[PDB]
TrEMBL record:
The lineage of its organism: Bacteria, Bacillati, Bacillota, Bacillota incertae sedis, Caldicellulosiruptorales. The keyword Zinc does not apply. It comes from the Bacteria. Keywords: Hydrolase. This is Esterase/lipase-like protein. It comes from Caldicellulosiruptor acetigenus 6A.
Amino acid sequence: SGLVPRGSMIPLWENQNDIPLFDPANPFVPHLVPYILDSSKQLPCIIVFPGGGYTHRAQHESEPVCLWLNSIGISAFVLNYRVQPYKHPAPLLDAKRAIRLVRYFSKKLNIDPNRIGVLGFSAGGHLASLVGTHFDSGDKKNDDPVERVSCRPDCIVLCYPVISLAEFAHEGSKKALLGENPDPVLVWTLSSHNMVSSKTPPTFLWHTSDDSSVPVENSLLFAMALKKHGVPFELHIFPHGRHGLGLASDTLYVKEWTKLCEKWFESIGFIG
């Protein structure tokens, strides 16, 4: 229709001087790309975190995912978070800011502030799992009204996620995010299965069992932690598929994850 924002750049911080840990020598400004649905009712929203090992952001995990989300009634955004040479905690700060921003502007964007979830692939799934475990309900006395808003997502979708930084770690992502001799404390707190709590939102995971880049153990570990803390979850592991299949539209049996995810969204009241 053209009446709603699609394809624009929404900076996470209005003023570049407010970007935490910003390197002005680096031209990249972290931002959201909207793919809003036009509708007369409030819509649920998913922010998509593309993968790319914390060195880039994969495009096949970006706009086409939002087209699928749109097709099932979900307004969507792509989060273009900071990557190498930025390090932790810059990407996580960008992810938390993105959720606060969308929730703050939810009335303007025609989005239900209580149906804002995140969906991440690979290192983007790591980032999604972090904002799904490291969240807070906002700084109510902050001078920035956006900072007063909760950064907790209302649901999490994890697609062949990087989860553990140590055992079964994707070493490329770990090195890009933390450097070569990382603090063991950060290795532990950024292994996101360690940080699941009873307040972690409902989660959907999928993975291929023979993934040779990001071991399927990463999804199994996060699932064990969700159960340990009483969080209901959905998990689908298919036997075969290379890492990074995205929506997997051309992959027999693996392309059945988006239909299962659509039905899970319905099951948790996110759509329908």
